[PDB]
A paper describes a structure:
The endospores of [name] are encased in a multilayered protective structure comprising core, cortex, inner and outer coats, and an outermost crust. Among the proteins required for crust formation, [name] and [name] are unique to [name] and are hypothesized to be instrumental in maintaining spore surface integrity. However, their structural organization and functional mechanisms remain unclear. Structural analysis showed that [name] possesses a negatively charged surface that enables pH-dependent binding interactions.
The final atomic model includes residues 1 to 125 of [name] and 18 to 98 of [name]. Further analysis showed that the central β-core was composed exclusively of [name], whereas the peripheral α-helical domains consisted of both [name] and [name]. Along the helical axis, [name] monomers stack with a helical rise of 9.52 Å and a twist of 153.09°, forming a continuous spiral of subunits. [name] formed the α-helical domains of two adjacent [name] molecules. Notably, α3 (residues 90–97) extended toward an adjacent [name] subunit through a linking loop, thereby facilitating intersubunit connectivity within the filament. The filament surfaces were predominantly hydrophilic, and electrostatic analysis indicated enrichment of acidic residues along the grooves of the double helix.
Residue numbers in the entry:
A (entry chain V), B (entry chain V): 1 to 125
C (entry chain W), D (entry chain W): 18 to 98
Write the structure that this text describes.
Amino acid sequence: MSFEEKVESLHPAIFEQLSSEFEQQIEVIDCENITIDTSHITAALSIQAFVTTMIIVATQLVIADEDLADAVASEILILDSSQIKKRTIIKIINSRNIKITLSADEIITFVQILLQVLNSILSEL
Amino acid sequence: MSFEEKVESLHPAIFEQLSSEFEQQIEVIDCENITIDTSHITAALSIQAFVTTMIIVATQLVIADEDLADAVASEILILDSSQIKKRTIIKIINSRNIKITLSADEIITFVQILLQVLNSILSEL
Amino acid sequence: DPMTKMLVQNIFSKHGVTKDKMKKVSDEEKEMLLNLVKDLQAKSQALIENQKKKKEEAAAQEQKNTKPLSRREQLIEQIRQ
Amino acid sequence: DPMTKMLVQNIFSKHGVTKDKMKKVSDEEKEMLLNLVKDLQAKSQALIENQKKKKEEAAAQEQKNTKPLSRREQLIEQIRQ
């Protein structure tokens, strides 16, 4: 069905773009045990990406004149581009054990901001 | 022939000792793609081990009074034991891809130091 | 909530979509959106509670770990044996 | 080179092998050592160039990878289709 296929096709395209902005490099010197914890990074990005396409696909469906639809959709994309950070908690447990942890707290809080936009848009319509 | 067999017999004994000092443990949590790159670690250790036995076998052959030969040979072994490190470059390409890399740079630079000792010993004799 | 009201009204008040441009459609497409939004609440909140319980648990085993006045007497018992 | 001269002379100046203890042998065993040392140079340098080309190549694909001012416009073209 048209609405289901369009949201499910825009989701992977948006998701891969979000993931590409989450690549960094950590270099560890003279260590034995290294633990890399990136849990919930993919889950939070999946939720944010799949809820972002809902915003730009809701206005696209209702509003004709596709030029306006592209304009509002583009403005949403730039909004998530800025004011998003990433933490790298490097916890040194022992003299031989370190633990690099990627924090999804900023993505989690930004999901709330986008969720309020989704609720406000739906109430507007 | 005596010189060829003695160097080719001391080489594996020295090489296995060097390898035994290059064992570590890396623990990865919640990751899909893991790449372990240990290239040139065995090649650099082979060169350093096979050039170390040349130093202790050159002085052993020329110099009589085996007690002195053991003394100089032991001093060479302790030299390589200290001031040798190891790097573990953990490059996080994506949120699901990490790449543990073992660097042979320290072994490479130490090969130059041992090579200069080999040249100086040969010029002395 | 009133906090997030004007950051979506101001963009609409710009050259974008205006009030008179709203189609105000009310059909079978509206209800299928409403249940999806409620599905978003269930999934997002599950992530929130999972992160929240991880945060307080990370502050739990350190509180349970009793810190004595001095951290050097724990190795005096075994050496004597 | 003069840099590495004294770290081998100082150990020999110790209770180890002295100048008068040198046999100073010059026979068929000397030439077979000389060609082996030159073989060491060829093999070691091959490792050095292999590592050197790996190092600059690792710094090559990142320079070729153009970094734009913003890294979020690459996913706007495909979504519109």
